[PDB]
Amino acid sequence: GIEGNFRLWDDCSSYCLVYAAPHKIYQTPLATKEGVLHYSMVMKDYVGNGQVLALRLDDFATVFVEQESLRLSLLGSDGKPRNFQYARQGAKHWSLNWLVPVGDDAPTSIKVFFKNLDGQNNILSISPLYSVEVDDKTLARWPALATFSVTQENVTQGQGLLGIRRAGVSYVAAPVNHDRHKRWSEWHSGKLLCLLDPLDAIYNYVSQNRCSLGETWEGAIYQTLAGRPVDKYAPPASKPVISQRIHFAKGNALEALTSHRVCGIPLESLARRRKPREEWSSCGNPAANFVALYIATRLPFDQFRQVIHNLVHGQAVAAPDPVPLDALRTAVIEQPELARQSIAQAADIFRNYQAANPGASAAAAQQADVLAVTCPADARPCGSGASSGVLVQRENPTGAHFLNDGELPSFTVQGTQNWNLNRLQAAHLRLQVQGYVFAGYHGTSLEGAQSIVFGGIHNRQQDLEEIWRGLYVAGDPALAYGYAQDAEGDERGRIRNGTMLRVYVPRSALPRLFATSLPLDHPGASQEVARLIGHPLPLLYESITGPEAAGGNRLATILGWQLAEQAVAIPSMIPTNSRTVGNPLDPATVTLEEKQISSLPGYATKPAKD
Ligand SMILES: [Ca+2]
């Protein structure tokens, strides 16, 4: 047993029992290019007399062990204290983990998570990966100078005990080359677990979408450095919610998450770099800037579609102070579509925040944490019972995850770049193998495409009857092509060419892809479509395919947003053209090769069983 200082790797590699005393801090060393360290140990504590144990993680955190909760208490470079609580729910065992990045240009946040366990080392649940931004002094301190320590905060009768098993630290190397933007792109997502042999089982179990997708260092070697850490954990009984809780010191959470959605930038990439290295000139900074500027005018976020339009066309606006409004006007006129994309996303994020936090100000939203929930990519709604004080980011897959290692596509007025007919077929294979089917063509603006393909298909406000809300697609490219452009003209009235996208939905949704012969503008559409799906509109986890409004010689598919948010989109090879904007689709331009992969799903014409 340990009644003083110790050596964790030596003493607790298999088992050691700490006789926690108040008034005594039992300390240990933690000594052992680019990569991740995963410190791990399995705990069984005894705090039966209401003892509270305090485990100092070097200089950056403190874990408090109470009988019914594991509490983490953080200290970044901000100085201010941030506290969290994880419920044990009667569990007597638990794992303590934390992930430290090492490198010259590695991330500047450490992660800390607990797992509740049964007697037999089976996962019962997992905590959020609590992320904590730390200074360069703190980052330099690993792996060689860092220490761990155990103590009891309170004086009680009885004897506080902490039995540690299977203490260890494992390294995993960053991949060779890999553009830094991409290399660490999963540091702030659930997929971080995929870098970790013990836990790679869990993420794959939850999503099913596999760790195959993303920069998850497939070829990496999860290697031990010291002690004897647990090597593998079994998939739990029920599916756990994998989630990362991320903080923003600058109080720019809405700006950041908006950038993330609009531009498809890793939340990690929008955080302190060790080596500053503006390469976010094209999308990142503008989008964030729009949110800041919009906030400064105090305009309701729901009115934004109107507002942006007015500022584009020199129509008045209800702002008392003209200076912030003008700052916005200027930025809006320079990039009216990107302004429209940016504040659309921000609007959705903020609407959700208020649903979890009634009467909360944008200013408050800006200082909230982001809770990146990797959804159980199957059932229905992941984000559930928000911890109040978080912006909930639901992580489903994105088109970009299915693209080759080649130079990533981009959406110019000349057209889609680095996108040939080979990459589409190869990317179509992956989507098939991964259990998706083509649902239809989608036409969007250039900036709309970067949003959808890289940031993912996220719900946006729309000037649509609340009932008919959803992502619109179409079997016939002609119908989608109508919308492959800026939604409206700038101050000169110019409408740029856009981009043609291919939306794919998951195969497992096929029973829920309904079809009617009745026009969607027909009065009795709402009732008939409701009869087909089992509830009144709007559309949840189901699609609807029917005749477009008017005579309309084509079929329009509306994906419900819940389905849409699980849907994925890649670039079509059907080009738009800068000279012909406003014309119909010239069918010469649609290749046969792409036509052959665009067979449509077998729609259902009868309500599901009851
Ligand atoms: Ca692995």
Calpha distance 457→182 (Å, rounded): 20
State the CB neighbour count (10 A cutoff) for residue 230: 19
Distance 221 CA to ligand 1 centre (A): 7
Distance 285 CA to ligand 1 centre (A): 34
Q: At what angle do helices 336-356 and 253-263 cross, to 10 degrees?
A: 130
Distance 328 CA to ligand 1 centre (A): 46
Question: Are 106 and 100 in contact, with CB atoms under 8 Å apart?
Answer: no
Q: Which residues contact 365 (CB under 8 A, 6 or more apart)?
A: 253, 254, 349, 350, 353, 391
Distance 563 CA to ligand 1 centre (A): 30
3-state secondary structure string across 89-135: CCCCEEEEEEEEEECCCCCCEEEEEEEEECCCCCEEEECCEEEEECC
Distance 195 CA to ligand 1 centre (A): 5
User: H-type helices in 170-209, by residue range?
Assistant: 180-183, 197-207
Task: List the chain gaps (C–N > 2.5 A) by preceding residue.
Answer: 32, 277
SS3 43: strand
Name the nearest CA neighbour of 468 among 539, 562, 531, 551. Answer: 539
Distance 399 CA to ligand 1 centre (A): 23
Distance 431 CA to ligand 1 centre (A): 22
Strand residues in 174-262 grouped as ranges (E): 223-227, 242-246
- Tell me phi and psi for residue 191, to 5 degrees: -55, -10
Calpha distance 449→459 (Å, rounded): 14
Q: Where in the chain is the domain with CATH 3.90.1350.10?
A: 253-395
Give the H/E segment covering residue 450.
helix 446-450
- Structure resolution, Å: 2.8
Calpha distance 338→342 (Å, rounded): 6
Question: Are 124 and 91 in contact, with CB atoms under 8 Å apart?
Answer: yes
Domain 408-595 = CATH 3.90.175.10: yes
Residue 118 among known ligand-binding residues: no
Calpha distance 430→109 (Å, rounded): 33
Tokens of 465: 């009857």
Looking at domain 253-395, its CATH class is alpha beta
**Which experiment gave this structure?**
X-ray
Q: Where in the chain is the domain with CATH 2.60.120.200?
A: 8-241
Distance 223 CA to ligand 1 centre (A): 10
Q: How far apart are the first and last CA of the chain?
A: 61
Question: Are 185 and 268 in contact, with CB atoms under 8 Å apart?
Answer: yes
Distance 172 CA to ligand 1 centre (A): 9
Which amino acid is present at 156?
T
Distance 508 CA to ligand 1 centre (A): 27
SS3 346: helix
Looking at domain 8-241, its CATH class is mainly beta
Calpha distance 189→371 (Å, rounded): 10
How big is the CA angle at 106 (ends 101 and 111), to the nearest 5 degrees?
Answer: 35
What's the length of the chain?
Answer: 610
Calpha distance 341→161 (Å, rounded): 55
SS3 208: coil
- Please identify which residue in the block is written with the tokens 């923003």: 248
Which amino acid is present at 435?
G
Using the CB atoms, write b or e for 189-207: b if 16+ within 10 Å. bbbbbbbbbbbbbbbbbbb
Distance 178 CA to ligand 1 centre (A): 18
How big is the CA angle at 372 (ends 367 and 376), to the nearest 5 degrees?
Answer: 155
Distance 194 CA to ligand 1 centre (A): 6
Distance from chain centroid for Cα 309: 30
Name the nearest CA neighbour of 322 among 296, 343, 301, 300. Answer: 296
Question: Are 169 and 229 in contact, with CB atoms under 8 Å apart?
Answer: yes
User: β-strand 93-102 against 81-87: which pairing, if any?
Assistant: unpaired
Count of CA atoms in the C-beta half-sphere (13 A) of 119 = 0
SS3 149: strand
Q: Where in the chain is the domain with CATH 3.90.175.10?
A: 408-595
Residue 348 among known ligand-binding residues: no
Calpha distance 32→142 (Å, rounded): 10
